[PDB]
Design a protein around this ligand. Sequence first.
Ligand code: ZN
Ligand code: ZN
Length: 335
Amino acid sequence: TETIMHANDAIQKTTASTRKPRLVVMVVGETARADHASFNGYQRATFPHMDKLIGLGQVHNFGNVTSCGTSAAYSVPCMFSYLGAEKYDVDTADYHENVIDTLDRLGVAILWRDNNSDSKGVMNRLPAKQYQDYKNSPLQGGNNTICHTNPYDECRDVGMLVDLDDHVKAHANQDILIVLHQMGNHGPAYYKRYDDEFAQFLPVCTSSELAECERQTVINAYDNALLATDDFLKQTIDWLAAQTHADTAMLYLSDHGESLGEKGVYLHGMPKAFAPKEQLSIPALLWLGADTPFAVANSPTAGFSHDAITPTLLNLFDVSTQATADKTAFVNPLD
Ligand SMILES: [Zn+2]
Ligand SMILES: [Zn+2]
């Protein structure tokens, strides 16, 4: 092949012809930091809906998880790579088979909706129709029907949840992966990231010049954008909970964290060798549907990282490959 292969031996252990189809939503978050999540002990209710599901035992919180880098351009390809953070090279990620390539080869129906930027190369070998731009409205050339609920005409992450039934109905009796790439908490204009229903921590910074504004007002806008992400995740889970013909899962991880003025540093993008802990520390949640066959994995001693995503996706689709032996995952393989 023209691709550097990592999982040429991959095969599904079971398929939808002998068991329920698998339906997974992977949410690629944006700029959310683990220590501003109420489920990791932040002293403000930034994730009220997820916290209620954690209390019920329906969502599992993996705690302080480490991102591989500090921007979507660096982190998103690595999140779907077989390489892992220590061998990853952003300049040559396009040349390797990635986990989406493997799943597509094995017949999983993949949809990637993007309200952020794009898939950073991950979707480039799949047909164009499996990637959908959700950062533009239809007349702008995209697909998002929820862009005109705010004065910035900014497209909202919840627009990506509109009529996901169309994809499910088009792929009867097949395994399905839906990736939703959020705008999330990207700054510096945090106040533009959420509709007025989520303007709850007040007052907010309404300038892109964050070091000018009072620190707490920057943080208030950031925390309001987390509330909107908590609502997006709740709506995603509510949709999956209705898909009772499938075994379902929702995995959420941010691409990196964010500095909010500690030691004078704001935003993200610092070289990972020098980046402060706040830029590398991300939340990670897993929801599983009713009667799930899956079990949450034993925690690594140092906590989880983005390197666990690729083996987790393979385990959720019953894919057997030597490429994920010895590798950490958030759920165990089914035997
Ligand atoms: Zn960024
Ligand atoms: Zn990012």
